[PDB]
Structure 1
Amino acid sequence: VNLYGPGGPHTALKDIANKYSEKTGVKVNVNFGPQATWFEKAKKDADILFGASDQSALAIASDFGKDFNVSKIKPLYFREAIILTQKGNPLKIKGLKDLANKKVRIVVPEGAGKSNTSGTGVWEDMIGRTQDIKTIQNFRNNIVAFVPNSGSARKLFAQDQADAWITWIDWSKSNPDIGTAVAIEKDLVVYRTFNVIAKEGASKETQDFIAYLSSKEAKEIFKKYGWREH
């Protein structure tokens, strides 16, 4: 069974795929990274596309045309956005409003229309919930880079220069050695989903693996990386 999707969820998926192979003897390959890196191979043998948000999964599945029926995207888990600071949070960042109010350098997970990426719209949806244009302006004025989430990359953009990144909890859980996670205000934070879509006319082994993704053993592994159901 061949899976394709963004770096990020791949950490949990590799753990799950390995465990699944132990149990069933069915080979499950987890291919991951920026879409451009695997798009041509996926055109030839993709059984399942996985995604790290709905809007990005929709865009990516829409690039395959007839191979995939975009209405069949299945949300399975969600997780929260976080602030990731330098180790030990030296600036004592307490949330998004604090980021707006301090003289800090922020990186946000935007692709600027050049790629499909899970973070599109996240920073604005959260800071917008302050309903204060000055807060929104101040936060934006502190943004030094608009670049897609690191995903499967262990390096952060501007690692030695920026003070904070807007990213996903599962990135921090997958990379405990990089940065310090700071929780976003509950009244502001957004949650986005992990999803899958099986190709049209998918095999029984493909369907069986999709079902496994909702098994107790899979739920356990997803939870370890910060993915939630309720």
Structure 2
Amino acid sequence: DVNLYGPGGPHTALKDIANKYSEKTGVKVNVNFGPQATWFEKAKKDADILFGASDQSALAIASDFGKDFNVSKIKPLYFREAIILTQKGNPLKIKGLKDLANKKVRIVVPEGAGESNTSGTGVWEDMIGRTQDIKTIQNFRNNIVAFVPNSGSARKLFAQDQADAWITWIDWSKSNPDIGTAVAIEKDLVVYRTFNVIAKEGASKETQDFIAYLSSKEAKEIFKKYGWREH
């Protein structure tokens, strides 16, 4: 029983992979996911691995288990870019972040307001801040209608009938080709955040083997299918 816990989002890629690893080697690999609160008590008892959707959020969650995990051992394996997700078909013809600042649009950004550890913290501001123009930053912010954590493993999008755009991650789109239209953020503005994992202290050899599988050729191509990169 190789048990994994982390946020919704990368779970889809990790379930493909755990599916494979199970029928190939017989090792039962469980992928637990969602908001930290919904699986904390459970994982407090049996987490083998914690996986994460950014470094800051991984650091914060692993620090919540005390002696069980040594946050020094967090391992970044892949990265992926932030995206703009619009309404299907992109009717407002949004071309990038600057466009979101300039038009009368309604933006939702992935902030948790110190209420939970989430992968989106600091993302919107680090991208728009790279315009180095205070008016644009001000304009972008005045168009923000909601500061809510990334929907992650939920298929529902906050304010999905009211908002015009969401700052989110490519992998969410890849996993839900269904919802919205992805728009590429300017290259000189965009940020990339990592997928990581950490093995518990004592990690059985069964665990260490799965972690290594995550860098194998089969795992790499699955991760790549969801927009997770290495180079």
TM score, norm. by length of structure 1: 1.00
Distance (Å, rounded) in 2 between the aligned partners of 1:177 and 1:228: 22
* Counterpart-to-counterpart distance in 2, 1:192 and 1:169: 11
Q: Which residue of 1 aligns with 2:31?
A: 30
Distance 1:65 1:190 in 2: 30
**1:120-167 deviation digits (Å, cap 9, x = unpaired):** 000000000000000000000000000000000000000000000000
- 1:22 deviates by 1.0
Q: Distance between the aligned counterparts of 2:133 and 2:219, measured in 1?
A: 41
Alignment partner of 1:63: what SS?
A: helix
Gapped runs of 5+ residues in structure 2? none
Q: Residue deviations 1:14-45, cap 9 Å, x none?
A: 00000000110000000000000000000000
1:194 shift after superposition: 0.1
Aligned to 2:141: 140
Unaligned 5+ segments in structure 1 are none
The alignment covers a number of residue pairs equal to: 230
Q: Describe the SS at the equivalent of 1:194.
A: strand
- Using the alignment, how far apart are the partners of 1:63 and 1:142 within structure 2? 34
1:85-138, Cα deviation, whole Å (9 max, x unpaired): 000000000000000000000000000000000000000000000000000000
1:108 matched to which residue of 2?
A: 109
**3-state SS of the aligned residue for 2:22?**
helix
SS in 2 for 1:217: helix
Provide the aligned C-alpha RMSD in A: 0.2
What is the CA distance between 1:179 and its match in structure 2? Answer: 0.2
Over the matched positions of the two proteins, sequence identity in percent amounts to 100
**Any idea what the Cα deviations from partners look like across 1:41-83, whole Å, max 9, x if unmatched?**
0000000000000000000000001000000000000000000
